[PDB]
Write an enzyme that holds these catalytic residues in place. Structure first.
Site, PDB file in Angstrom:
ATOM      1  N   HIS A  92      18.382  43.018  18.683  1.00  0.00           N
ATOM      2  CA  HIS A  92      17.873  44.245  18.078  1.00  0.00           C
ATOM      3  C   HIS A  92      17.903  45.451  19.008  1.00  0.00           C
ATOM      4  O   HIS A  92      17.873  46.585  18.518  1.00  0.00           O
ATOM      5  CB  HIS A  92      16.437  44.046  17.580  1.00  0.00           C
ATOM      6  CG  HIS A  92      16.322  43.093  16.433  1.00  0.00           C
ATOM      7  ND1 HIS A  92      17.062  43.228  15.279  1.00  0.00           N
ATOM      8  CD2 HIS A  92      15.554  41.991  16.262  1.00  0.00           C
ATOM      9  CE1 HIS A  92      16.757  42.249  14.447  1.00  0.00           C
ATOM     10  NE2 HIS A  92      15.844  41.485  15.019  1.00  0.00           N
TER      11      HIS A  92
ATOM     12  N   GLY B  67      12.201  45.158  18.005  1.00  0.00           N
ATOM     13  CA  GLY B  67      12.031  43.791  17.550  1.00  0.00           C
ATOM     14  C   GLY B  67      11.969  42.754  18.652  1.00  0.00           C
ATOM     15  O   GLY B  67      12.737  41.786  18.642  1.00  0.00           O
TER      16      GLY B  67
ATOM     17  N   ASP C  88      20.816  34.280  12.681  1.00  0.00           N
ATOM     18  CA  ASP C  88      19.377  34.501  12.743  1.00  0.00           C
ATOM     19  C   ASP C  88      18.849  34.929  11.373  1.00  0.00           C
ATOM     20  O   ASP C  88      19.598  35.373  10.500  1.00  0.00           O
ATOM     21  CB  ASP C  88      19.061  35.563  13.801  1.00  0.00           C
ATOM     22  CG  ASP C  88      17.576  35.723  14.058  1.00  0.00           C
ATOM     23  OD1 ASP C  88      17.087  35.198  15.080  1.00  0.00           O
ATOM     24  OD2 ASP C  88      16.897  36.385  13.246  1.00  0.00           O
TER      25      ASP C  88
ATOM     26  N   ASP D 140      14.663  30.813  13.235  1.00  0.00           N
ATOM     27  CA  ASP D 140      13.626  31.281  12.325  1.00  0.00           C
ATOM     28  C   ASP D 140      14.047  31.206  10.862  1.00  0.00           C
ATOM     29  O   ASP D 140      13.328  31.713   9.993  1.00  0.00           O
ATOM     30  CB  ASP D 140      13.198  32.706  12.691  1.00  0.00           C
ATOM     31  CG  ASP D 140      14.373  33.619  12.980  1.00  0.00           C
ATOM     32  OD1 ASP D 140      15.523  33.132  13.014  1.00  0.00           O
ATOM     33  OD2 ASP D 140      14.138  34.826  13.189  1.00  0.00           O
TER      34      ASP D 140
ATOM     35  N   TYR E 125      10.190  30.596  15.761  1.00  0.00           N
ATOM     36  CA  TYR E 125       8.770  30.778  16.024  1.00  0.00           C
ATOM     37  C   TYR E 125       7.912  29.586  15.624  1.00  0.00           C
ATOM     38  O   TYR E 125       6.692  29.626  15.823  1.00  0.00           O
ATOM     39  CB  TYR E 125       8.281  32.055  15.330  1.00  0.00           C
ATOM     40  CG  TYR E 125       9.164  33.224  15.691  1.00  0.00           C
ATOM     41  CD1 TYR E 125      10.083  33.736  14.784  1.00  0.00           C
ATOM     42  CD2 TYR E 125       9.124  33.775  16.965  1.00  0.00           C
ATOM     43  CE1 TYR E 125      10.910  34.789  15.125  1.00  0.00           C
ATOM     44  CE2 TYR E 125       9.945  34.824  17.316  1.00  0.00           C
ATOM     45  CZ  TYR E 125      10.835  35.327  16.393  1.00  0.00           C
ATOM     46  OH  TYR E 125      11.652  36.372  16.745  1.00  0.00           O
TER      47      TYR E 125
END
Ligand SMILES: CN(C)c1ccc(C(=O)NCCCCCCC(=O)NO)cc1
Ligand SMILES: [K+]
Ligand SMILES: [K+]
Ligand SMILES: [Zn+2]
Length: 361
Positions: A125, A133, A160, A249, A288
């Site tokens: 990002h 981000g 992602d 994620d 995460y």
């Protein structure tokens, strides 16, 4: 040859200090080591990127301020503050991850390997003069700029959950690097860019491919979309090196709770790219659910090594974190797929039309 594994105990210790993902790097390496996969790879200690190397993409002004706050009113101007707090030592953390990806890219161009892995990298990002981000440094762009010294056309594939806007913005004006991002796209969802009509600018027009996807997609349909796009991209763009971002994620159980993927589906997308027999730089960053992220990248590392892994999580440092069944497999959540078949066909057909211009160089 044998895949290169970017690792050092000091580097993993550095990556564990990121507040958003505490001890994730240790969990990832510990599980990889618990399966003895590191014995089948070439361990390469990563260097720390110099100011000259980080300046190939990031501006001097942004790098000076990052180094000052690492040891302020202008922090918000450079994107430091909320999502990216200017903690003590943040510049060395950025230089460590950026240097790790540059190291892996250097191994690719030296013929040492065909696949180089840096799971802690892939922070896609960050802009040339703005953090964003949780990304202070765009090591993905730095890795591409290093491979660019040897490979003429580089394909960047971003799997992602989020749109890889920083990498896409970096190369939006060039036809020598093609960015392909599959991501959740919905008004209000970060970073809010990357609709299918986002194709690039100037001479880079039609060299940015974006696949907007809704919540709840699973392995079968995801590989259908990915293989469909990668097949057309490979024949229209004809790349010589691949940078693959595999943020975890998207996996079921992640607090993002958007996609409903398992590592088997991501691995099938990875197998399709490895079949191209090209130099491939593997990045991660996203993820995460710490145990599920270690599950995914350990499985993907096995896919790279061509090995089949035991379902049972072997006892190790972080064994208690792998509930409830303590197996490597991940079960999808029982929630609907919001991707309409007609919407996906409409997005794929729009991309097919864009890629026809690429076949007309
Ligand atoms: C509960 N809590 C405090 C938060 C929850 C979500 C966000 C968020 O998505 N912020 C937008 C930035 C998301 C960037 C994610 C980085 C990533 O995975 N890129 O691929 C923020 C705070
Ligand atoms: K993506
Ligand atoms: K481009
Ligand atoms: Zn993400």
């Amino acid at each position: 040859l044998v895949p290169v594994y970017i690792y050092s105990p000091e580097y993993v210790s550095m990556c564990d200090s990121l507040a958003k993902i505490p001890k994730r790097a240790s969990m990832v390496h510990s599980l990889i080591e618990a399966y003895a996969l590191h014995k089948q790879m070439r361990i390469v200690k990563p260097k720390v990127a110099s100011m000259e190397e980080m300046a190939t993409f990031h501006t001097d002004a942004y790098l000076q301020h990052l180094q000052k706050v690492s040891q302020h009113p202008d922090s918000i101007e450079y994107g430091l503050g909320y999502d990216c707090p200017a903690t003590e030592g943040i510049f060395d953390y950025a230089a460590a991850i950026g240097g790790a990806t540059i190291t892996a890219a250097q191994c690719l161009i030296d013929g040492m390997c065909k696949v180089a892995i840096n799971w802690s990298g892939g922070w896609h990002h960050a802009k040339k003069d703005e953090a964003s981000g949780f990304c202070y440094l765009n090591d993905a762009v730095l890795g591409i700029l290093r491979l660019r010294r040897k490979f003429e056309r580089i394909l960047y594939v971003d799997l992602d959950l989020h749109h890889g806007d920083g990498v896409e913005d970096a190369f939006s004006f060039t036809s020598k690097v093609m960015t392909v991002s599959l991501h959740k796209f919905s008004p209000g969802f970060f970073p809010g860019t990357g609709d299918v009509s986002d194709v690039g600018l100037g001479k880079g027009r039609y060299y940015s491919v974006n696949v907007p996807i809704q919540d709840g997609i699973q392995d079968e349909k995801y590989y259908q979309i990915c293989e469909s796009v990668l097949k057309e991209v490979y024949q229209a763009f004809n790349p010589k090196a691949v940078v693959l971002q595999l943020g975890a994620d998207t996996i079921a159980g992640d607090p993002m709770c958007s996609f409903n993927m398992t590592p088997v589906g991501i691995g099938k997308c990875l197998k399709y790219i490895l079949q191209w027999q090209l130099a491939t730089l593997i990045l991660g960053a996203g993820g995460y659910n710490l145990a599920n992220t270690a599950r995914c990248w350990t499985y993907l590392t096995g896919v790279i090594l061509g090995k089949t892994l035991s379902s049972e999580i072997p006892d190790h440092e972080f064994f208690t974190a792998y509930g409830p069944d303590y197996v490597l497999e991940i079960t999808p959540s029982c929630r609907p797929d919001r991707n309409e078949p007609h919407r996906i066909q409409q997005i794929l057909n729009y991309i097919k039309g864009n890629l026809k211009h690429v076949v007309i160089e």
